[PDB]
Design a protein around this ligand. Structure first.
Ligand SMILES: O=c1ccn([C@@H]2O[C@H](COP(=O)(O)OP(=O)(O)O)[C@@H](O)[C@H]2O)c(=O)[nH]1
Ligand SMILES: O=c1ccn([C@@H]2O[C@H](COP(=O)(O)OP(=O)(O)O)[C@@H](O)[C@H]2O)c(=O)[nH]1
Ligand SMILES: [Mg+2]
Ligand SMILES: [Mg+2]
Lengths: 393, 393
């Protein structure tokens, strides 16, 4: 079995997040790697952006990323990438023709990639598996255009792979999806890498990151886009410092795009610290060093940062939003905040910072919790999904 | 020979202009009709927007328009149509597969249509002929995206068909076009329909349109978009009425999208009159009834209204812009204004309104002039263009 995965607008090889690179990228790369271990051949197609990488990147046995040239290597933001839909498809058509390579099935990620895959599937007479990841309908002409396309994929993909059950409800409610085509594939997290793990480990991480050993630490991890709520953490942190101006707290925010600006405006620059985005082998230390990981997302999806925080033995305080309620066992492995007000987040941060015994236990419980996912697990579900799709064509 | 013409975002069957329908539409339909008379089979592919029309419209022997479903029949403005690039292509792929129809060559119109045709041409192993019509580079992310695509077509089409020589210079200067691929196909105008034509004809047209027989008439014809300059005519007309408040002048503006609003604000509503867009058999009367046709375009292309005005024996006052200097023999068949100031246009309008002998002669000379184009003529050039392209594949 050879699968073509399509990831048009962002490459699995991009440092997540910064950029347009986040959970979706690591979802695609992690599932792909596990599929490849299981004997399944995966080619992940993405738009070429870094010519030093070459056309074909051999990632591991059975795993390749294909950088397809379509428009300049730069000066094209996500919003304009629709203009490259036909060219990127054509890119894949040449590549496959040139390399004489045939696929059993296509698995597209995000609506741009799906539009590509819908054309390819009729042409190649193979099935399309589509994963939305995020949806317009969950108010501009550009979003109505995107919705309309998301609507097309819903009506045409052979299988709609969603990441949670709540996402399946969304497909059914907002997109009139036929439930017989939706299929829940519950995601994973690299649970061997992200891990507590050793009794000296937190304080080793702290030495390594230059954090003082005796202080409480809250961490934000991920893209510094406003829908991710880092502003909420900074605002909440400021609130805590009005209540008690010498609270023993430091914040590390990690990593990529100003918020430092908001933090000076609010008088808290000295206790906040912005870490550059880094690869997973190095993010572990951020998680380990943190007492609490705050994930104040406005939109979401399926909660990957929450999962890795948990895996690594650190309780999470998340927004009641997207996948987070499922990624976090409210009251057992962390807290869920309603809304994004600074007052509410200060309260929730205060209750875990001041109650040592509770927080220490949430952390331990989270490890057991996070072990319910499992990229391997995720691949095994996709494995079956694929087999069925092929079986039924 | 079967040619597939691609016209994604606007259909040759749409009333020009209103809408997104103008010279390009009538260019595509007129060339197509003449190609069909000459024994060449044309299928013009367009996005389906009016379901009462059905999938295939038999226009005349060898001529069909194909309405391809791709996104809603409405709520999708031109700016969003990139999101339907892959779907519209896929639409054409199904249709051709379903109908078992094969093409010798593709001729695409406008950058959206070309992106579609570029993919189709590699897939079908046939040549692509591309006609830009208008170009971004002749300042937003959306226009930079469009330019970038226009740049792709320049680099990839087998033949770049331009409408004038000045357009070829643009391809070479702004798009680094290789001159060996550019080919000038000079356009036409329906010169039997648009025509003076009979000594009672102007005053017959006037009775028909309800215009007073003894008054000077200026006409604007075409889309009421701001780049078309109707505001310039209205502003200029107002200027004339400051100079001489009982000048014997009436204006007819025809036709589709406020300007009436601008005309009241300026005190001239009573001498201006907005005609609904109408089909060519009925536009003749507007041209015939006019003493002068004002074409204050800001952008352009290749000057179709100017040509039909001329054909119908009416002198033109045009902006020194796009094709207009070639469509109009400055000083022989009308005037060319530099810039779009009201003062300049009043001057130019005043010199032709007050000098009866000159204007009457320009009109007669214009008839002889307009006979240099010739949709038949245009088709014959495309005929050869096609044969060469096929011959050289
Ligand atoms: O320095 C960093 C910070 C972020 N992450 C990764 O970024 C992803 C972001 O996940 P999140 O769900 O919060 O972003 P989203 O999916 O909302 O786009 C996670 O997998 C992290 O492991 C990373 O690799 N390095
Ligand atoms: O009521 C009308 C007014 C306009 N036209 C047609 O509209 C086209 C507009 O041409 P123009 O070049 O001025 O518009 P553009 O090409 O700039 O889009 C011409 O072919 C006209 O014959 C028409 O068919 N009916
Ligand atoms: Mg920790
Ligand atoms: Mg006349």
């Amino acid at each position: 079995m050879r699968v073509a995965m399509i990831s048009m607008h962002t490459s699995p090889l991009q440092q997540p997040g910064t950029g347009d690179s986040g959970g979706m990228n690591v979802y695609i790369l992690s599932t792909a790697t596990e599929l490849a271990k299981q004997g399944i051949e995966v080619d992940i197609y993405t738009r070429a952006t870094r010519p030093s990488q070459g056309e074909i990147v051999r990632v591991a046995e059975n795993l390749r990323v294909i950088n397809i040239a379509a428009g300049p290597y730069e000066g094209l933001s996500k919003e304009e990438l629709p203009t490259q839909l036909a060219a990127f498809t054509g890119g894949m058509l040449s590549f496959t023709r040139r390399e004489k390579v045939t696929y059993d099935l296509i698995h597209s990620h995000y609506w741009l990639s799906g539009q590509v895959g819908w054309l390819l599937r009729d042409l190649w007479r193979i099935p399309l598996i589509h994963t939305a990841h995020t949806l317009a309908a969950v108010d501009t002409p550009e979003s109505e255009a995107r919705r309309i396309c998301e609507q097309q994929l819903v009506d045409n993909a052979d299988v709609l792979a969603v990441n949670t059950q709540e996402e399946m409800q969304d497909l059914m409610h907002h997109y009139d999806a036929d439930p017989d085509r939706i299929s829940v594939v519950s995601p994973g997290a690299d649970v061997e890498l992200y891990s507590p793990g050793n009794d000296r480990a937190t304080e080793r991480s702290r030495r390594e990151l230059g954090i003082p050993l005796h202080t409480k630490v809250v961490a934000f991890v991920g893209r510094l886009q406003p829908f991710k709520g880092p502003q909420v953490l900074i605002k909440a942190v400021a609130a805590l410092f009005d209540r008690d101006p010498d609270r023993n707290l430091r914040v590390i925010i990690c990593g990529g795009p100003t918020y430092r600006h908001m933090a000076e405006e609010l008088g808290v620059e000295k206790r906040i610290r912005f870490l550059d985005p880094r690869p997973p082998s190095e993010l572990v230390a951020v998680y380990r060093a943190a007492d609490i990981v705050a994930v104040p997302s406005f939109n979401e999806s399926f909660g990957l940062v929450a999962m890795e925080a948990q895996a690594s033995g650190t309780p999470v305080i998340a927004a009641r939003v997207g996948g987070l309620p499922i990624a976090v066992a409210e009251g057992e492995t962390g807290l869920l905040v309603d809304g994004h007000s600074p007052h509410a987040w200060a309260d929730a941060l205060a209750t875990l910072l001041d109650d040592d015994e509770t927080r220490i236990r949430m952390g331990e419980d989270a490890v057991e919790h996070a072990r319910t996912f499992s990229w391997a697990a995720t691949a095994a579900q996709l494995s079956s999904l694929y087999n069925d799709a092929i079986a039924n064509e």
